[PDB]
Design a protein around this ligand. Structure first.
Ligand SMILES: [Cl-]
Ligand SMILES: [Cl-]
Lengths: 135, 133
């Protein structure tokens, strides 16, 4: 189970979920994830479409506002992740290692500083949760 | 024919029209709000399954499901308001492009068709995965 994004996420909940601080920090991480997802989609959609009706300067201004806001959201995602994993490793590091998910919720050792891999990871987690939504 | 293909064609056909564009931004926003709400609700349930007894968990689940229904109704409304506009105003361009039903697949008496929540997931996931790096 724990090999997958979804498996590691569910193990993190099982291991750390009784700690109220860990719980709140993880709620915050998922929220930072949906925020970044939302800003990316909002932007990408507007970049696809705004060209069919905005002049160059209007488009330039819009592009910059969306761009800066998306980047900030990405930095917040990254910070939320790092802060959460540092906490759970500090407090449950042994349990995590025993469960096969040493280092926490992120599947990488190598790429946990990688802006695009963190964005890829967030997409996978959020997609999996959405697709597994209960009937 | 794909979710993303039809979305792209819809922008090409209707992008110049500010009223269409505004309604479509609305639909995309409602879709992301729905997706976000479902994720947060599912996370809450996953965390809560370990903290609550079965009665408490059933009440939580019912609260979340009701809220989800009401947000789903809202998504449907945004899709309808947008799609009825483009179908009325660009019906023949849509026909010519092979997407007569607009941004969502046409109804069929023959087979099932994609659930709206599934469609929205496909559309939003597709836009995310194809983002500029
Ligand atoms: Cl690891
Ligand atoms: Cl069709």
């Amino acid at each position: 189970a724990t090999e997958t994004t979804m498996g590691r996420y569910k193990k993190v909940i099982e291991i750390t979920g009784h700690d109220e601080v860990a719980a709140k920090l993880l709620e915050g991480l998922i929220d930072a994830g949906t925020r970044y997802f939302s800003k990316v989609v909002e932007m990408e959609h507007r970049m696809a479409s705004a060209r069919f009706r905005l002049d160059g300067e209007e488009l330039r201004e819009l592009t910059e506002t969306l761009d800066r806001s998306r980047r900030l959201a990405h930095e917040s995602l990254i910070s939320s992740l790092h802060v959460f994993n540092r906490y759970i490793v500090k407090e449950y590091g042994e349990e995590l290692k025993e469960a096969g998910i040493e280092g926490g919720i992120f599947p990488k050792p190598e790429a946990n500083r990688d802006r695009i891999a963190i964005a890829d990871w967030a997409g996978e987690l959020l997609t999996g949760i959405y697709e597994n939504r209960h009937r």
